[PDB]
Amino acid sequence: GSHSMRYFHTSVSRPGRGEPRFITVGYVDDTLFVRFDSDAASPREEPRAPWIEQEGPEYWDRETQICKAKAQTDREDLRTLLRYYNQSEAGSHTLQNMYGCDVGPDGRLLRGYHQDAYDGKDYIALNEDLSSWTAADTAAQITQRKWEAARVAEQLRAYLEGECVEWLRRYLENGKETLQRADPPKTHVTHHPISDHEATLRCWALGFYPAEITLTWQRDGEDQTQDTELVETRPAGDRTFQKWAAVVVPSGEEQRYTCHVQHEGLPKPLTLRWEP
């Protein structure tokens, strides 16, 4: 199907406790494959997936050098942002950045991304055209003016249409055992009485990859959107994900309730009911 590659970066300042901590991770779809942490003993980018281990030592040296350079630029940017927002030097602040590409089944570019956030708020983003910017405020307009002057979007566009797509295709081939395998969810329905009058039906989905999934409860064929408790999809820790959806039903009406499961690994959407 479709695929994505993303690099996430976070710098967090800590006045009086040294220089900002910098952590970056890279993902293909929902699979972590590289990491870098400036607080590590001897900071290097390290493999986190079997299929990336085969890259040569040149790959790791160049990747490590890019990470270290980003860490230094983030440190200067954090200093800059204090000025843009007329802030004290006493508090801890956050700079986040994501970039990457999406490709379709034919491996052709669907769209690229490059976005920043300051203190958890949208700051500046590359537009879908890969040539213009959207600045969130007057501070970010100064950054936009700088980036426009230095032809930043042009270099980004070249990366996103070129190496991002080409290396994502390479990663998909080298890790095709796992990256191109969808593990369907294992499903079951549980029943927990809460009183004499009502009970909780919980629809479970376990052991699935990728994370994207739809779990819905229906009563007499209508979606129980407003009365469904739906927890965030969560990682099991072995590559797979988990999710459940619960509904409170009047006792004796359990059979009117059906759980519906949509996942990429399933040829047909599943319909489940509780079995006493």
Binding site: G26, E63, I66, D77, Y99, W147, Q155, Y159, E163
Partner: peptide, 11 residues
């Protein structure tokens, strides 16, 4: 593979 920008995109 990561994007090589060499600090040119300072905020």
């Amino acid at each position: 593979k990561r994007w090589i920008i060499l600090g040119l995109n300072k905020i």
